[PDB]
Amino acid sequence: RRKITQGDDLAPGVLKIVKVYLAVKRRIQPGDKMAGRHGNKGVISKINPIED
Amino acid sequence: TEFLKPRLVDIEQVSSTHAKVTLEPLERGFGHTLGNALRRILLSSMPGCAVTEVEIDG
């Protein structure tokens, strides 16, 4: 609790800093760069449905 | 579930050479299920007539 109560001092002057986290999921889409361990590279042209 | 109804069929037509059937709407994979299905029909099976054999009497 000591660490929780007084361990919040950050920078001289600005002792009150509010840090907010913003989680943003980023997916795979036409334009992503995919590769392999072996060295081959690649960029998805048009991710087609599994129908094709 | 929802469904779509094919409308706005803008038939670009020229007498006998070609017809270009413009038409909406098609979700991902329908201009395929239909387009390729039609070319399949037009290269393999279309009940019509033609000359099967010709003997040149000469």
Q: In this structure, what is the dihedral angle of CA atoms A33, A34, A39, A41, given to the nearest 10 degrees?
A: -50
A contact test, residue of B30, B32, B34, B36 with most A CBs within 10 A: B32
Q: How far apart are CA B7 and CA B23, in angstroms?
A: 7
- Contact between residue A9 and residue A15 where contact means Cβ atoms under 8 Å apart: yes
- Resolution number, Å: 7.9
DSSP H or E segment with residue B32: helix B30-44
CB pairs under 8 A between A and B: 7
Nearest chain A CA: its distance from B17 CA (Å)? 31
Q: Do the beta carbons of residue B6 and residue B24 sit within 8 Å? A: yes
Q: Is A52 on the interface with B (CB under 8 A)?
A: yes
3-state DSSP percent of chain B in helix, strand and coil, to 5: 25, 15, 55
Q: Round to whole Å and give the CA distance between A12 and A15.
A: 6
